[PDB]
Write a protein that binds this DNA or RNA. Structure first.
Ligand SMILES: [Mn+2]
Length: 738
RNA sequence: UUACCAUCAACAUGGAAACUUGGCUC
RNA sequence: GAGCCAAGUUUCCAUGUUGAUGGUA
């Protein structure tokens, strides 16, 4: 196993006797802080300890059903009436009590002089300020109380908040200091697209438009029905005095249709959130940023321990915790994971087991691949700017062709007179028109060019179906960084040409491993990519996408079963399904609706009635793991499984760290088995997941997700932004999308 | 677009609970 | 009074994607 530390962060044991009230303010105050001040002033009637969210409140004592209080606003001496209802009891301290738990612990963070930014709390006393880009990088913790199989935990990981130490108003002031002619247009271009955050209610808004005619001295109407000015609004509610009465106003017109009336924002107390573009190019600034932000497991655990010491040091936060019956542990939680054995990577004439690094970038380019096709009559499309460089590749391509036992002829020498996209398209079309037996088509470009990749995959997956390869000069012009890159280039070449690269021994007989990916960037239509194994060694993968109603994946399953029929000759046995991640709260929509809708598609086939295991694969995980080495906390070894205590209560799931981590702490991947009709054991199912983590052929090593999952992700990525079309059926038997 | 991995920044979606609004039904 | 549906607000979150900067081959 692995004696890791941390896992889900320390146990936070709680208490009972909560009561849920809905405080109505007449007139309604729109400020959380001043409403909290009124309900702390009224502690004679509402009791010593209150948990207030802004509109919904929690007390440890049962009041009466209707409570009317006469409070005074601390700004204009406005006599307002507080209307305390009595809604819920919340006796058993179930999942219903979790938002109240997060409310009291968020105030526990708040009165430690930690600012609330986004969903997290950050410490300004730990300031790391860069005056070169006038910003502060000040750290904090992303705290949230959750419930898992081990019980009630508080998850907090080290989040660093990039606060530009200059308001949005100060940003336009600085721009006006720089440019005083076209200040408005460039300020609008900078602000639109990246958000601002209002710090009086920590709320983030996208700058849809900026109104320079609108002024805070002008008056607007609330949703309640009162005509008030912005100086008056902020002064009576939030207590903010507007310094400069000539600001613009930021409008955040929301998405779809009151809801979509408008939202108006003041630049004075809204701040920028993003990394400056001047900071990105600066090598020393980014060196400081990624030396102080990618914390080691030692530094991450030390920051969490410093948070624990700060909480135990301040008497007010601890007093709040015990007066609400909460308690934080002395240190973080300690359980043990499990290290899976390394899997033997198989080639033609030999196979090798792997060491702790789980990388085979040098163990591959000594032995021949299991099936490489006789690569002949291929072409190389290059421009003259990479001329000599490109010639070198061809030479070392032969110097790699021998080691991996793959026969390569001198290709076509095709020139690209210009780097235009349609020039590439027409020269590949001319090459395919002249000779119809061209196997592979490879182009070379300058810089990250997404539209060239789009049209190359357009032509080589839709119009004229041929395997293709795209090469960039950002890396290929490096002398010492060339051999290990050309190795992976030739491996991808053999992969997309239909030749089977390295395999892993799959211990399950006659299975159809399926991965799907629902790609929806907004714009473009949502597309489900679908990759299904059609062999016993799982080396060739059938592919198909659909365009969406998401339950109707149409003929994907029956086409996969038809090609498995045509290849394996009337012996289908098993189906293993790997779906993309969905919010918890979309697991039932996946579980009890979509799967016993696609399981009825098997009736189209002649009385099959198969087995089926459906996963939900969740990748972005804010839970961190550190190995508790006898000196300190180090990076966990690849192949680590946490199948308990940090997983969901309702379902069967596990977290797998299946990759080499050199920077910071790794992200384990969450796999939730929503269907297990084939009666897979957890050990066999996660070993199959790790086996497919080995199976990804575009990286000579293991990855965090299974190979069909990343195959479907690349395929749906293609059909979303790179194709906008179903791929041609000729290439669907190959891994053309790598 | 040779890849993989970290960490920041950001959007969209969904769940749950209160309140409000509008509809049907005892 | 009372059950259900739809939408919005406020709290809590959850997941996916995007861009960026690094590390390594
Ligand atoms: Mn995906």
């Amino acid at each position: 196993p692995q004696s890791l530390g941390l896992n889900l962060i320390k146990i936070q044991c709680h208490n009972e006797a909560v009561y849920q009230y809905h405080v109505t303010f007449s007139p309604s105050v729109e400020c959380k802080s001043m409403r909290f001040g009124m309900l702390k002033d009224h502690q004679s009637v509402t009791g010593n300890v209150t948990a207030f969210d802004g509109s919904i409140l929690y007390l440890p004592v049962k009041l009466q059903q209707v409570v009317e209080l006469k409070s005074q606003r601390k700004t204009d001496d406005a006599e307002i009436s507080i209307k305390i209802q009595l809604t819920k009891i919340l006796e058993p301290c179930s999942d219903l009590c979790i938002p109240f738990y997060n409310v009291v612990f968020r105030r526990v963070m708040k009165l430690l002089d930690m600012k609330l930014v986004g969903r997290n709390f950050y410490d300004p006393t730990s300031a790391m300020v860069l005056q070169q880009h006038r910003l502060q990088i000040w750290p904090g913790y992303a705290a949230s109380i959750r419930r898992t199989d081990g019980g009630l935990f508080l998850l907090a990981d080290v989040s660093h908040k990039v606060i530009r130490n200059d308001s949005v108003l100060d940003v336009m002031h600085a721009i006006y200091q720089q440019n005083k002619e076209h200040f408005q247009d460039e300020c609008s271009k900078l602000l639109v697209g990246s958000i601002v955050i209002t710090r009086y209610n920590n709320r983030t808004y996208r700058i849809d438009d900026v109104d320079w005619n609108k002024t805070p001295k002008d008056s607007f109407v609330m949703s309640d029905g009162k005509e008030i000015t912005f100086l008056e609004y902020y002064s009576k509610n939030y207590g903010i005095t507007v310094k400069e009465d000539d600001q613009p106003l930021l409008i955040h017109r929301p998405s779809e249709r009151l809801l979509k009336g408008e939202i108006l924002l003041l630049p004075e107390l809204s701040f920028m959130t993003g990394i400056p573009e001047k900071m990105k190019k600066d090598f020393r600034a980014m060196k400081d940023l990624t030396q102080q932000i990618n914390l080691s497991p030692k530094q991450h655990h030390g920051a969490l321990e410093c948070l624990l010491q700060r909480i135990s040091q301040n008497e007010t936060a601890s007093n709040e915790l015990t007066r609400w019956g909460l308690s934080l542990h002395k240190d973080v939680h300690k359980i043990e994971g499990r290290l899976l054995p390394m899997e033997r990577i198989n080639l033609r004439n030999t196979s090798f087991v792997t060491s702790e690094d789980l990388n085979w970038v040098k163990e591959v380019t000594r032995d021949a691949s299991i099936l490489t096709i006789p690569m002949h009559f291929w072409a190389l499309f290059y421009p003259k700017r990479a001329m000599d460089q490109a010639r070198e590749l061809v030479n070392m391509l032969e110097k790699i062709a021998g080691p991996i036992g793959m026969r390569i002829s001198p290709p076509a020498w095709v020139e690209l007179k210009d780097d235009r996209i349609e020039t590439y398209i027409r020269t590949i079309q001319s090459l395919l028109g002249v000779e119809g037996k061209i196997q592979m088509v490879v182009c070379i470009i300058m810089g990250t060019r997404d539209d060239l990749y789009g049209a190359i995959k357009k032509l080589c997956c839709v119009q004229s179906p041929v395997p293709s390869q795209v090469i960039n000069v950002r890396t290929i012009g490096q002398p010492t960084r060339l051999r290990s890159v050309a190795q992976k280039i030739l491996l991808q070449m053999n992969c997309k040409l239909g030749g089977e690269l390295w395999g892993v021994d799959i211990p399950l007989k006659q299975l159809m491993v399926i991965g799907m990916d629902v790609y929806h960037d907004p714009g473009m239509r949502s597309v489900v990519g679908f990759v299904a194994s059609i062999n016993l060694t799982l080396t060739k993968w059938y592919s198909r996408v659909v365009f969406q109603i998401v339950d109707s994946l149409k003929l994907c399953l029956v086409g996969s079963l038809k090609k498995y029929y045509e290849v394996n000759h009337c012996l289908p046995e098993k189906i293993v399904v790997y779906r993309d991640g969905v919010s918890d709260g979309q697991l039932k929509t996946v579980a009890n609706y979509e799967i016993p809708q696609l399981q009825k598609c098997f009736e189209a086939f002649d009385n099959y009635h198969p087995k089926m295991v459906v996963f939900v694969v969740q990748k972005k995980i804010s839970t961190n793991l550190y190995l508790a080495a006898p000196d300190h906390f180090v990076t966990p070894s690849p192949g680590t499984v946490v199948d308990h205590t940090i997983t969901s209560c309702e379902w069967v799931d596990f977290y797998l760290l299946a990759h080499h981590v050199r920077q910071g702490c790794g992200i384990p991947t969450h796999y939730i088995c929503v269907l297990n009709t084939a009666n897979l054991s957890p050990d066999h199912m996660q070993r199959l997941t790790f086996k497919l983590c080995h199976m990804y052929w575009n990286w000579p090593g293991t990855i965090r997700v299974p190979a069909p999952c990343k195959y479907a992700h690349k395929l749906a990525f293609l059909s979303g932004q790179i194709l906008h079309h179903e791929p041609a059926i000729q290439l669907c038997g190959n891994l053309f999308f790598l």
